[PDB]
Design a protein around this nucleic acid. Sequence first.
DNA 1: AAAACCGCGCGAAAA
DNA 2: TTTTCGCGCGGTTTT
Lengths: 82, 67
Amino acid sequence: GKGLRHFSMKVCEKVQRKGTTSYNEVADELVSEFTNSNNHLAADSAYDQKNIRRRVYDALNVLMAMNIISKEKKEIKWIGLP
Amino acid sequence: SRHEKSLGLLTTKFVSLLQEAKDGVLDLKLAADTLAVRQKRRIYDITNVLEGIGLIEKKSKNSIQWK
DNA sequence: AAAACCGCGCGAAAA
DNA sequence: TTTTCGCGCGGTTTT
């Protein structure tokens, strides 16, 4: 639904599927998907967008430290799970 | 200095702490101290993303299993 | 009820 | 100025 745990999975899928990408491409697409959820209310998009945005930094950063992805001066690249 | 206090660094430590403690079991209480004791909250930052990926799992309160 | 968890988002440090 | 993102106050979930 939400929470770091649910967004880290979104993040990790996105990056592998794109091979190479950026913070903004990742975040904008997660925001857009959450926002087009059938059970979502328009009044709540600005919050949410902000919140998903802060969440993505936390995910990228541990994922980074696990050597699962790249992130080198705005360029984020996939690597692999273990 | 704001880099010394990065989730990412904490992460690296948590990992080493993790891979050292054999069995595959880690006590969230140990790491807490061992990890700068910067504040509990942060530990959950690490566990939530490792759980979302499926590299770990809650085994029992204050405790988690690798892979 | 107590102990564990962990949403959130402000505001200051790095680009 | 904008991009990152430390920090910790409460609210939720488990025990």
